């Protein structure tokens, strides 16, 4: 169970993960400003792809990023146990 995070720019974050599941059909990357009922935004990558780029974060905000594995057989989302808090500026 691995997660690697690189801040490419203060507004842009590159995430790589290795999650211990099989037949992961999609990886869902969910990011949102902490609390405040902010908009919660998802980016979907096919299960082949274990890296994603988040960009256009607001310049001065605490974002929470969570990675989920989606399995079509179950119709179910499995959370990655590691989650990211990022401070954009």
């Amino acid at each position: 169970t691995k997660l690697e995070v690189v801040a490419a720019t203060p507004t842009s974050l590159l995430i790589s993960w290795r999650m211990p599941m099989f037949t992961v059909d999609f990886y869902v990357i969910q990011y949102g400003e902490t609390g405040g009922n902010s908009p919660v935004q998802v980016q979907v990558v096919p299960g082949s792809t274990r890296t994603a780029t988040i960009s256009g974060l607001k310049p001065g905000v605490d974002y929470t990023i969570t990675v989920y594995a989606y399995v079509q057989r179950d119709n179910l989302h499995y959370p990655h146990p590691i989650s990211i808090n990022y401070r954009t500026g």
Binding site: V28, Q30, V40, Q41, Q43, P46, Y68, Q72
Partner: protein
């Protein structure tokens, strides 16, 4: 039962933004396969709702609102935004509980000779109230002189065609937008997912 999202997301013709379709779906299991098969999305933003816990919502009706807009106007399909799409075509309430899903439709809706069948309301006397729709083709009186119902110098036919051509920039390309609004019986903290 499974949500008819296939009919929403996969339809041959999407609505003009002024004529945005509303489909009412009684409480249904969201098959995420259908949604996720469309990716990458320009936006998949949810407000008051966690996108991946959409099946856990204790919702009674979901409204799918569907239409085509330019990519740079997808910014306007959000609570509290302003601009000619938010103001005159499709207004979201400030307390929206739901998701905005937008995907680039350049391959389906543009034509090399230009698709002009997708219309937006360019002029309206007053802003739309949330989820209001207005399909009237009254001539808009911009000037002092009444228009007599005929177009002219100060009198505009209120609907304008989007020009969608494959070679337009990524911002001018057509994006299909689906807006999901949920009627929630209880706060999202309750759970009513599949047994």
């Amino acid at each position: 039962n499974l949500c008819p999202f296939d009919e929403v997301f996969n339809a041959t013709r999407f609505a003009s933004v002024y004529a945005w379709n509303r489909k009412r779906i009684s409480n249904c299991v969201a098959d995420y396969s259908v949604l996720y098969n469309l990716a990458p999305f320009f936006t998949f933003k949810c407000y008051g709702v966690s996108p991946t816990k959409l099946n856990d919502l204790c919702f009674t009706n979901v409204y799918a609102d569907s239409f085509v807009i330019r990519g740079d106007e997808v910014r306007q399909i959000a609570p509290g935004q302003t601009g000619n799409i938010a103001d005159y075509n499709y207004k979201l309430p400030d307390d929206f509980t739901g998701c905005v899903i937008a995907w680039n439709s350049n391959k389906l809706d543009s034509k090399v000779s230009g698709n002009y069948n997708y219309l937006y309301r360019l002029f309206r006397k007053s802003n739309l109230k949330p989820f209001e729709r207005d399909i009237s083709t009254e001539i808009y009186q911009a000037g002092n002189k009444p228009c007599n119902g005929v177009a002219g110098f100060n009198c505009y036919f209120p609907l304008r065609s989007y020009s969608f051509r494959p070679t337009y920039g990524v911002g001018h390309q057509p994006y299909r937008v689906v807006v999901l609004s949920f009627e929630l019986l209880h706060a999202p903290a309750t759970v009513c997912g599949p047994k």
